[PDB]
Design a protein around this ligand. Structure first.
Ligand SMILES: CC(C)(COP(=O)(O)OP(=O)(O)OC[C@H]1O[C@@H](n2cnc3c(N)ncnc32)[C@H](O)[C@@H]1OP(=O)(O)O)[C@@H](O)C(=O)NCCC(=O)NCCS
Ligand SMILES: CC(C)(COP(=O)(O)OP(=O)(O)OC[C@H]1O[C@@H](n2cnc3c(N)ncnc32)[C@H](O)[C@@H]1OP(=O)(O)O)[C@@H](O)C(=O)NCCC(=O)NCCS
Ligand SMILES: O=C1C[C@@H](c2ccc(O)cc2)Oc2cc(O)cc(O)c21
Ligand SMILES: O=C1C[C@@H](c2ccc(O)cc2)Oc2cc(O)cc(O)c21
Lengths: 382, 381
């Protein structure tokens, strides 16, 4: 009873990092078909051009350069034996990018490394033992007694999952300060285009690299810590009739994506039930009276959710800015959206970190099809 | 009032193994025959001495000679074989987990609708959606079950799922956590090689198994009967242990690397783990507590027994699991917990923990990581 915290798990800091290499969407169909030596696939290239034109992405950050692809031609093939070459990149770069994000969150938070009691590391980009959690513990110099959770092969709802894990840890352990880190490197999934896998082609229009980190704790110090958001509740559901809508396989040829059914339609037709299950207990029913942190999976998911739920254009603005500037960074994306939301809220002189609203919703979407729903509370901005 | 009041408790434990049983006495001959490695006579003699010292009687293995004949790339030391291994393990991991979970759910006796959370742990393959999703479908759990998928975890995973379940169960009023650890050696099984004697060690020790438990805080007085209480959970990276246990998921499947004195590293650090866990409770006699030690192999249990000064009885449940199942990675400690309460009841002892009040559970794995849980027994009539 005295070993547990009293109040709600709170986000006390958010930091983000991306590879320096920036790939512009306007020139990407030419780049992708040239470096994979696929320019004879002219009809496929035109299909890819239309996907990039509709993507609502301006740029992505990618560790993978043409120099790396030239040294790894089997990564350029659609489905060649290449997992070992991909792991040799991702098992180093995932924790290093995570280090970049974690250092920025720790600097914002301003407390000593010794106060971090727990680490949750989440990725979809390769697996190893010991894990990225161990590697980051060594890179940052965390205490050897840090309690670690290594969340591997999670997918796009992982950002929601690490907040749900951190909420229970922070609330149940007095003094606990949880470092959460999501880090994604597309070198695990990047491959040449193929007419038989148009879903892989969609992935190559959307997926980017990035890492995000947060410090989560309950009972924040009034003077030395600064709340950004509160984590109120977390729910998860498998959508009806969604079997196989999003599958991801780690194979001899790296990570491959498989899409069936209508992912935007399945999510959009179930989202209102997720909102009601989360918000009815709080007496909230106007979805325009809350701020929105939607996983920016792609423009069709944000468009169909906005349309079906009846959102004003401003609700999806922060999610769309992440999509525009970074693409889909799988598990890291929602932490980027949280960061954009609080920064743009303060910049626009609004009264709270959540666009001047009190209550907010965070959605992750991924394989299952799984929807993770978190209720958030904003904090006042001076 | 959204949070639980009391301690996370184990309310049920179930286990399952593949029916295929491989006897250790005949295993060096079987292993060298099915990997077509009979020309490696000096390697076979080294393997025979590893099996003789293993203190394993039998292991359960999904992989049969019929499956190995259909998958010759798996029999080579290092051929491209991850896809063939995944085709087996991505189906059998959740299916074996189902077997363990159904037995724990039967012991518990509550409706499936009471299960609010699922934690699935494996070291045997990865996929999206995960084994957590597959098991949700196999059991008929509610679509609103809150899942944690713990992939590529290693031998401390059994301790980690209890640490996770403790925080979930204590922080969520009414929460009932199903935890499942399930391991299939099809991911790691390969032919022998003179350059990789640590792989030979793995082939002497690793077996298949799944274990499940139901965890909850504030057990219903009428409907639920506790087995063990989860008091505290700690984790540490051992000093000077960099590279002691590495595990790579490669084009050729899961490969193990041992690059130190694993038994010496664990035994040199275990007393400090005991003191960190038990000094706050005023406990100093390590023979006054029950022991749930990950049966990583006989040298770990021997060196810990020797360094800490344990009576032979303390490691008995851990050695029975090693004997009857081998090292089942993350599942092993839940097998030991089950053996401990069953043999405690059979011997007419006054608690689930060999008649003791307090116990310790240790997982060991890559890092080198040691996970330490403090347990409390419950009275037995
Ligand atoms: C791809 C995308 C950015 C642009 O598509 P759009 O706005 O629908 O535009 P259009 O449908 O007019 O054209 C896009 C092309 O992509 C194709 N396409 C879209 N989704 C596809 C899929 N899953 N598999 C195959 N092709 C697909 C269309 O068939 C079309 O090809 P065409 O021009 O040769 O007919 C958009 O469809 C999208 O956001 N997709 C959903 C997001 C998503 O699935 N996220 C998953 C992340 S896990
Ligand atoms: C393998 C084991 C059963 C053999 O028992 P033992 O008492 O060491 O037996 P011996 O020393 O008489 O012989 C064992 C043989 O295995 C070899 N061996 C043991 N551990 C080894 C390792 N990590 N790498 C390579 N060879 C190893 C020994 O050198 C010896 O070979 P030899 O006959 O050519 O000298 C025992 O050492 C053990 O329990 N080790 C496992 C502990 C462990 O690391 N488990 C990790 C799982 S996570
Ligand atoms: O195949 C992939 C790629 C992966 C990914 C994206 C961005 C990044 O930087 C790294 C990995 O995200 C995914 C997320 C899924 O739910 C299913 C998937 O199949 C995949
Ligand atoms: O390579 C393996 C095999 C794996 C395993 C054991 C039993 C089983 O049934 C399935 C997988 O356990 C491990 C545990 C480790 O800490 C490191 C490892 O490298 C491995």
């Amino acid at each position: 009873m005295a070993q547990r915290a009293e109040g709600l798990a709170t986000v006390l800091a958010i930091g983000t990092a991306v590879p320096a290499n920036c790939v512009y969407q306007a020139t990407y169909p030419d780049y992708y078909f040239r470096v994979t030596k696929s320019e004879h696939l002219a009809d496929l290239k035109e299909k890819f051009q239309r996907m990039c034109d509709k993507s609502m992405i301006r740029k992505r950050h990618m560790h993978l350069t043409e120099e790396i692809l030239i040294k790894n031609p089997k990564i350029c093939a659609h489905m060649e034996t290449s997992l070992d070459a991909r792991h040799a990149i991702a098992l180093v770069e995932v924790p290093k990018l995570g280090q970049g994000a974690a250092e920025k969150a720790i600097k914002e938070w301003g407390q000593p490394l010794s106060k971090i009691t727990h680490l949750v590391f989440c990725t979809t980009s390769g697996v190893d033992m010991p894990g990225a959690d161990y590697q980051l513990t060594k890179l940052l110099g965390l205490s050897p007694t840090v309690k670690r959770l290594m969340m591997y092969q999670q997918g796009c709802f992982g950002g929601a999952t690490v907040l749900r894990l951190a909420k229970d840890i922070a609330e149940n352990n007095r003094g606990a300060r949880v470092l959460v880190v999501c880090s994604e490197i597309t070198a695990m999934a990047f491959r040449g285009p193929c007419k038989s896998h148009l879903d892989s082609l969609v992935g190559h229009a959307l997926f980017g690299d990035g890492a995000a980190a947060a410090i989560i704790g309950a009972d924040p110090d009034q003077l030395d810590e600064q709340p950004v958001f509160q984590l109120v509740s977390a729910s998860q559901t498998i959508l009806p009739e969604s079997e196989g809508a999003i599958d991801g396989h780690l194979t001899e040829a790296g990570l491959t994506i498989h899409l069936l059914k209508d992912v935007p339609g399945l999510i959009s037709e179930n989202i209102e039930q997720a909102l009601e299950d989360a918000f009815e207990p709080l007496g909230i029913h106007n979805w325009n009276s809350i701020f929105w942190i939607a996983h920016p999976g792609g423009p069709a998911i944000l468009d169909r959710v906005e349309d079906r739920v009846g959102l004003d254009k401003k609700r999806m603005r922060a999610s769309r800015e992440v999509l525009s500037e970074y693409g889909n960074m799988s598990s890291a994306s929602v932490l980027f959206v949280l960061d954009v939301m609080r920064k743009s809220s303060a910049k626009d002189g609004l009264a709270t970190t959540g666009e001047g609203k009190d209550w907010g919703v965070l959605f992750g979407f991924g394989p299952g099809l799984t929807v993770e729903t978190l209720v958030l509370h904003s904090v006042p901005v001076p």
